[PDB]
Amino acid sequence: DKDPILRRSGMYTVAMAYCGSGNNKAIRRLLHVAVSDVNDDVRRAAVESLGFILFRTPEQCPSVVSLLSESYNPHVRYGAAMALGICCAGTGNKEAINLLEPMTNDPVNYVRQGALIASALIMIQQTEITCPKVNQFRQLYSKVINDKHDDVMAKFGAILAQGILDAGGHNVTISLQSRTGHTHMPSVVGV
Amino acid sequence: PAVDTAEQVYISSLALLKMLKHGRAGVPMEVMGLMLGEFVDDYTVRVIDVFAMPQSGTGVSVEAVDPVFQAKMLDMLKQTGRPEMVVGWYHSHPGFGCWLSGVDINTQQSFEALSERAVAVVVDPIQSVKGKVVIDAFRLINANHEPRQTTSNLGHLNKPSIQALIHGLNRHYYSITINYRKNELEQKMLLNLHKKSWMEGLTLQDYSEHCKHNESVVKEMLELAKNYNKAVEEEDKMTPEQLAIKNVGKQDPKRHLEEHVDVLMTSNIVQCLAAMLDTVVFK
Amino acid sequence: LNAKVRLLREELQLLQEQGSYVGEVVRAMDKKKVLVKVHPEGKFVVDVDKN
Amino acid sequence: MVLESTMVCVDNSEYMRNGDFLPTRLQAQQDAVNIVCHSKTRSNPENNVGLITLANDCEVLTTLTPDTGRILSKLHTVQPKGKITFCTGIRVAHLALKHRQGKNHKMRIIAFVGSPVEDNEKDLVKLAKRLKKEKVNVDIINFGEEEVNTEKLTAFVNTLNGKDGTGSHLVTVPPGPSLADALISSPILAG
Amino acid sequence: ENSEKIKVNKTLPYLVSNVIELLDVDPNDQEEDGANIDLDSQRKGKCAVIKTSTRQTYFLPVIGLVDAEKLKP
Amino acid sequence: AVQKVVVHPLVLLSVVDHFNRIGKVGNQKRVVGVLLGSWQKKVLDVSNSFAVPFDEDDKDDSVWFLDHDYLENMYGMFKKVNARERIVGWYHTGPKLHKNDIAINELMKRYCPNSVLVIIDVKPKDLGLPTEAYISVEEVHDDGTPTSKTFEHVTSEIGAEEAEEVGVEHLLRDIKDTTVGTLSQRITNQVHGLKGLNSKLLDIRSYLEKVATGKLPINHQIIYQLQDVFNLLPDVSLQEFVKAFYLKTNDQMVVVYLASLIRSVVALHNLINNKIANRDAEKKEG
Amino acid sequence: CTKIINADSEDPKYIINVKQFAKFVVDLSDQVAPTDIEEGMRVGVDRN
Amino acid sequence: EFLHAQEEVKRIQSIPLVIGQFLEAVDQNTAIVGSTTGSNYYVRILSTIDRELLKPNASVALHKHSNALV
Amino acid sequence: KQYEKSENDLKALQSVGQIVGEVLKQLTEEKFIVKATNGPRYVVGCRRQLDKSKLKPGTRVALDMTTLTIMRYLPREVDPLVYNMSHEDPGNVSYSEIGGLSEQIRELREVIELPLTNPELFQRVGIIPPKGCLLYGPPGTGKTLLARAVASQLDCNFLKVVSSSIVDKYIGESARLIREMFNYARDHQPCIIFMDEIDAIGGRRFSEGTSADREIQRTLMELLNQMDGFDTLHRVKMIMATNRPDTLDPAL
Amino acid sequence: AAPMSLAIHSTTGTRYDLAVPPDETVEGLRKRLSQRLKVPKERLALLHKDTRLSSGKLQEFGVGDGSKLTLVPTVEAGLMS
Numbered sequence A: 001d002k003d004p005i006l007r008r009s010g011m012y013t014v015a016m017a018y019c020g021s022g023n024n025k026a027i028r029r030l031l032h033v034a035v036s037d038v039n040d041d042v043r044r045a046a047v048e049s050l051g052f053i054l055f056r057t058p059e060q061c062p063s064v065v066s067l068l069s070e071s072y073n074p075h076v077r078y079g080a081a082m083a084l085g086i087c088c089a090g091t092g093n094k095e096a097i098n099l100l101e102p103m104t105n106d107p108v109n110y111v112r113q114g115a116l117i118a119s120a121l122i123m124i125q126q127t128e129i130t131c132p133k134v135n136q137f138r139q140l141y142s143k144v145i146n147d148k149h150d151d152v153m154a155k156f157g158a159i160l161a162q163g164i165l166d167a168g169g170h171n172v173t174i175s176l177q178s179r180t181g182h183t184h185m186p187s188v189v190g191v
Numbered sequence B: 001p002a003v004d005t006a007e008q009v010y011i012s013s014l015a016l017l018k019m020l021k022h023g024r025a026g027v028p029m030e031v032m033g034l035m036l037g038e039f040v041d042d043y044t045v046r047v048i049d050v051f052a053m054p055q056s057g058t059g060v061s062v063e064a065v066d067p068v069f070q071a072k073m074l075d076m077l078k079q080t081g082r083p084e085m086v087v088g089w090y091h092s093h094p095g096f097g098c099w100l101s102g103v104d105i106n107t108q109q110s111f112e113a114l115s116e117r118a119v120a121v122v123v124d125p126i127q128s129v130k131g132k133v134v135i136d137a138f139r140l141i142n143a144n145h146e147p148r149q150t151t152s153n154l155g156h157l158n159k160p161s162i163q164a165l166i167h168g169l170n171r172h173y174y175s176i177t178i179n180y181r182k183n184e185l186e187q188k189m190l191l192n193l194h195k196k197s198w199m200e201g202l203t204l205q206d207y208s209e210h211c212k213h214n215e216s217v218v219k220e221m222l223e224l225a226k227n228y229n230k231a232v233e234e235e236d237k238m239t240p241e242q243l244a245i246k247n248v249g250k251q252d253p254k255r256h257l258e259e260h261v262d263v264l265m266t267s268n269i270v271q272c273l274a275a276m277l278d279t280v281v282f283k
Numbered sequence C: 001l002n003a004k005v006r007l008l009r010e011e012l013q014l015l016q017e018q019g020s021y022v023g024e025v026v027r028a029m030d031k032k033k034v035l036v037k038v039h040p041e042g043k044f045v046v047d048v049d050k051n
Numbered sequence D: 001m002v003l004e005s006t007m008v009c010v011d012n013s014e015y016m017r018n019g020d021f022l023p024t025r026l027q028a029q030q031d032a033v034n035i036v037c038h039s040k041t042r043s044n045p046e047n048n049v050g051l052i053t054l055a056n057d058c059e060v061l062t063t064l065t066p067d068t069g070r071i072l073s074k075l076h077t078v079q080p081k082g083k084i085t086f087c088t089g090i091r092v093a094h095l096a097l098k099h100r101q102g103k104n105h106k107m108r109i110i111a112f113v114g115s116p117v118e119d120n121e122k123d124l125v126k127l128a129k130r131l132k133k134e135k136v137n138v139d140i141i142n143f144g145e146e147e148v149n150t151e152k153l154t155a156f157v158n159t160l161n162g163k164d165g166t167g168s169h170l171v172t173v174p175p176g177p178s179l180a181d182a183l184i185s186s187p188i189l190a191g
Numbered sequence E: 001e002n003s004e005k006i007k008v009n010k011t012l013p014y015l016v017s018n019v020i021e022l023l024d025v026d027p028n029d030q031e032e033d034g035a036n037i038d039l040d041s042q043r044k045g046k047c048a049v050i051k052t053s054t055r056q057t058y059f060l061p062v063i064g065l066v067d068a069e070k071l072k073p
Numbered sequence F: 001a002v003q004k005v006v007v008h009p010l011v012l013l014s015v016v017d018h019f020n021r022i023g024k025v026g027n028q029k030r031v032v033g034v035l036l037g038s039w040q041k042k043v044l045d046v047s048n049s050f051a052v053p054f055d056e057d058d059k060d061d062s063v064w065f066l067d068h069d070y071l072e073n074m075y076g077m078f079k080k081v082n083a084r085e086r087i088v089g090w091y092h093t094g095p096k097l098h099k100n101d102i103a104i105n106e107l108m109k110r111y112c113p114n115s116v117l118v119i120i121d122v123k124p125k126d127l128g129l130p131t132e133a134y135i136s137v138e139e140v141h142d143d144g145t146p147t148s149k150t151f152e153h154v155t156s157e158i159g160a161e162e163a164e165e166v167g168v169e170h171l172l173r174d175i176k177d178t179t180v181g182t183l184s185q186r187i188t189n190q191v192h193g194l195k196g197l198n199s200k201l202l203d204i205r206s207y208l209e210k211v212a213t214g215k216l217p218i219n220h221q222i223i224y225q226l227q228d229v230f231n232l233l234p235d236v237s238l239q240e241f242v243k244a245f246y247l248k249t250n251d252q253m254v255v256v257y258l259a260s261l262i263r264s265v266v267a268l269h270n271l272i273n274n275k276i277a278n279r280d281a282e283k284k285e286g
Numbered sequence G: 001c002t003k004i005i006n007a008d009s010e011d012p013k014y015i016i017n018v019k020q021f022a023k024f025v026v027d028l029s030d031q032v033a034p035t036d037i038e039e040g041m042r043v044g045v046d047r048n
Numbered sequence H: 001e002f003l004h005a006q007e008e009v010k011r012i013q014s015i016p017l018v019i020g021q022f023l024e025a026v027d028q029n030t031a032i033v034g035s036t037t038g039s040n041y042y043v044r045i046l047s048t049i050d051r052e053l054l055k056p057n058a059s060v061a062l063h064k065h066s067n068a069l070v
Numbered sequence I: 001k002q003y004e005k006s007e008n009d010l011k012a013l014q015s016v017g018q019i020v021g022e023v024l025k026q027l028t029e030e031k032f033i034v035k036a037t038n039g040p041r042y043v044v045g046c047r048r049q050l051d052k053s054k055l056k057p058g059t060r061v062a063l064d065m066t067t068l069t070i071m072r073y074l075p076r077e078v079d080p081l082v083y084n085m086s087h088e089d090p091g092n093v094s095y096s097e098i099g100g101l102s103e104q105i106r107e108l109r110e111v112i113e114l115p116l117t118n119p120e121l122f123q124r125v126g127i128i129p130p131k132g133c134l135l136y137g138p139p140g141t142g143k144t145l146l147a148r149a150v151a152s153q154l155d156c157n158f159l160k161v162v163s164s165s166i167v168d169k170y171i172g173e174s175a176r177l178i179r180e181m182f183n184y185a186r187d188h189q190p191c192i193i194f195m196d197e198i199d200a201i202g203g204r205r206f207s208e209g210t211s212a213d214r215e216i217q218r219t220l221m222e223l224l225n226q227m228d229g230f231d232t233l234h235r236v237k238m239i240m241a242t243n244r245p246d247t248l249d250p251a252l
Numbered sequence J: 001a002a003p004m005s006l007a008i009h010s011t012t013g014t015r016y017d018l019a020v021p022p023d024e025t026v027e028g029l030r031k032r033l034s035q036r037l038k039v040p041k042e043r044l045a046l047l048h049k050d051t052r053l054s055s056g057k058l059q060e061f062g063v064g065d066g067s068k069l070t071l072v073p074t075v076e077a078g079l080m081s
């Protein structure tokens, strides 16, 4: 199609059709759109969809979004951040956080916002022992929100991230797939 | 009572070309004009077509000279199928960026009093380059708080420039996102401008000119290869920093050789393929 | 290639920063100041950065 | 007062050479349409009037305009020639008044016919039904008096205002020399 | 009100100048509407060129608030 | 005679906007207007346009209205805005030439005797330019006897000033592939030209079919032209021509061979430099 | 520092010549009375 | 995208510029350039410029504020 | 009339000046290098409706102040000094009042007046008319009177200067005055320059001397090379006047 | 009174319909429109039959009940003045 928004609907359809199957062809399509399209929102929607395909093998999302985070296009950066967020949900990977750290101080603001929300999604409920970097991230949220020299979008991101980190008391997690392994359709829809 | 930050002003292709051309015409002067369109929703303000206006002024100010033209032209355009009525005004700042001044603000304030959601569009012909066009749409903040309400990131994606801030952005006026949405036939003709006739595709070159061009470039490559030799012998007896200055004001053989090789090889391949393709097609 | 494009895309703001004068130092003196002739203007007693 | 856009249909066929009706019948029609146009201008300021000469085929000599000076100026230099074509004349006049400058105006026509018509009556009624379906009001003047009656002409004017349309007229004028303006009283002064 | 605006626009500080020449200039050719300037064209009388005391020469398309022929180089 | 006619992108886009607006208004299949511009000693220059209300009877091609009064008023207003531009011709958005065209042109011919007609299709199902230009001339026959007025095609192209170029290049961010190198000179042509030649030959073949099957009459100037066309086609089995073709292909090859040698040496040099840099970095690191 | 060159009209209006800067036509601030200033005497003026 | 960016940075080369001389290049991306006003400067060199044309004491056009060598 | 003057003044108040500078080269179709009089050189645009064929490398041009857009061309500048050199008033002496000079006035008219009406004679004999003549003689004889008569009676333009008023303090300004004067004459052909007391600057060029002496000698070299230098002078005539012809440079 | 009920169409589409006394002057209409719109009266310019209403009483210009009046504001741009 020529209308950009319908193309975005198409990327979302690819995302929801192949949810968790890791279908290499759907990945091929989304990445080709991510690097080749002319609109920026379609690029962002494409990078984001990758999260839905590859969430059963979180070891693979960083492998295909590390280079894409360090991208000239800010919307692609935000897409990589949120793709890591959905893909590695409730897992607390060292790698995901290693990618999400440097870019939480990205010059563009909405990139910082997406980075903070992605970190809050990944490192939900983890204590000091489980991940060494939880305390760093709580302190980062506090510093960002208190600061006044920083942008408003970043403050929004930090606030939502504080909300996410400790949700429903401290006794609820985000699992796209049920403990047996079935895809949890409400979780996909919600995220 | 919102004016959300997701509100956009839709400029058509024709309107953009008209603004840009009119502005470049009066390069030292603040030429100006009107824009016709519609008010669809609280998130869209569509600008369909524009029309220049009779005017006179100096390099420091410009003003209309007749309103008869405005009403008459509205009637004529309405006759042939463009009933839309005015939605704002545009003018050109030739080299000063895009912002609003005191006089600008005064005229825009009169327009806004006329209709609430009026916009001001500013173009900078000389600052616009081949690809990107320097342009922006504005509106006036009152003396009341926050001028507009936020329900998305659609407002905060542009990083307003230092000059626009200095001259009053986000203090007396606020910007609006500009969308260049286009229909199918516009898309189809914009792609059809740069297309040459079909005969040009299958025309060879004057072969004598071909050979002269080839021999000229090769006679250049001779000396470039000599200099390449004279230059590779260095790069060992040269300090790691000194090399970064070795190539300032002095030809470099490597890059020129790369360029000439690409030129020669492309040109010859294309000529050969055309010759063979013709050799087959026409009997 | 990505780095090259990013640098080119930023270069518009980097090229709008002011410049720096070229001065001929006359003699370092005092705590950390220097006396610098700024052709064509007169001399100054300027500060010296940390580096 | 009722905004009404008419289009006069002066004729300039070779049969105007005759003087049966004051010198050079064309002169009789000239004076008649001149007074008629003045009448229209006095009917309503926003009203307009036009001139579509019924020459060999046609030539709209002046499109709709509230001002009449152009109408009368173009009215001269109408040295007659050839033969008329009624169907083409009405069709062009209709196409022309479809494009009112003010679409609120009510479409209408007034005709000055003084020649023999060469066209089967069936197609005349066909053009009549079309004009009716498009809500058009003619007012035929059987000037010239080639038939001084129905020259395959009555059916057209009955159909157009058929079902007591009271919108179309056939004010036939006899060959007696006396400028029609005195004759025509209803279609012009008050329908 | 004219005199009040005039007086306010005559703030005391002036940048003294000497008139260098009093050119007589006329329009070259027709100027398209939409883009027309009253200085380059649309000027029939004389015009002045002045050298301010700051070693800067200026062209005054409208001479100012004094009759032209009084002034001399 | 006009050696060339140059239209400007603004005109094309304005005609497209016109057709969109009327079609949105509906009940039409063509649009008509004017064209403003100037002359440069037989190299025309069309630069701007505006509308002119018009309507036609599809069934019979002898009924039509064109409010020339609108044309005069708009010429007054435009000439007030831009003096340097005077009427140059007229345009219409029908796919292909209509029967009224000579009638309208003779109407238009009053405003500019040297009036050229420019058709701007707005739905290109082809690979070729979007405009066709036509100039009305008297044609005298050797047997066709009566002298009518027929349109003679004249070369046309698209041209733009720096402002228009900037704007279009800005809007053209929907697809873009420059690759000025061999990729362009092989997509813009070869394939494109062969496709166009095929389409033209197919049109000639359709007409020939129609004549042969009786659906049409025979035209003798067409037959003579086609005979000349078939007589032009060269023969590629002459020893002289084969000799010449091989000679020239050989020269072209020696040049490409030299080019490739140059490139190989440069790439090898780059590999060597990278290897030396890696070795030095390792030795320093060790 | 500026060197007055002329004192035109009874109304205070003073032509001063700032050395190597410019030459102006300025007026008297309130502190100085008109009698204090004569032609040819160095005077001090502000930077605005 | 690189060709695109190259064609987009060229707005820094707007028409009202200031002539100057290129005196000496101190590393790449910086050079001492002597303005026509008479004051030397330490400025930034635009990426696109072909360095083969920055011969010593070679005529050059500078930005009006940044004074970058354009 | 008061309100017309008032509105004229109020309209006049809103208008700005154009920097005057010289075009040095035309880079591309819309790029000109302009050297503003103060000295800073700019690359600037050009208004679209302006005969760009008249902006040769040297035309004077009026630049707008904000964008520096070329906006108008002007004829060469005429310094106020030269305006005064060219608007003197030699009373109304006629040739009658000059008594006792008949041969001399004939020679003078032969030199300056005849070639300005009757060049065909000089073409028939085959000679180029002479340029300038020195009037030397004891004080009070009639030199300046003759020059005033020549100025008033004759019809070509006149330029009158005292060589002791050319000289100026700043180095390289007197020479510029001489050069610009001769350029002005070269423009308004025909013209006559009457250098009065050329002994004020025409003095033997010594080997040994001081700074001011050297500066005046530079002025004199400029004059000498303007009279008969690389550029043929053509149709401007000269007359000098001295009571000390002896103290003059042999090259003059 | 016999108020003259006119129409004031703006070039934008909105319609500020108003009724005035018979003896109103173009200055008075301009002034009332300025109060309604909160814009200076100089910036306005009324139109009738493609003919500005420069000044003076409305009647002798011909402006009558059930008339069409276009209201057109001024358009100005410039660094200063």
Ligand SMILES: Nc1ncnc2c1ncn2[C@@H]1O[C@H](COP(=O)(O)OP(=O)(O)O)[C@@H](O)[C@H]1O
Residues within 6 Å of the ligand: I097, I098, I099, I100, I101, I138, I139, I140, I141, I142, I143, I144, I145, I146
């Ligand atoms: N031949 C003459 N006829 C009349 N007056 C003369 C004559 N010669 C000198 N004068 C007088 O001398 C004055 C002119 O001086 P002039 O001879 O022109 O200059 P210079 O001082 O170089 O001799 C006049 O007042 C004039 O009356």
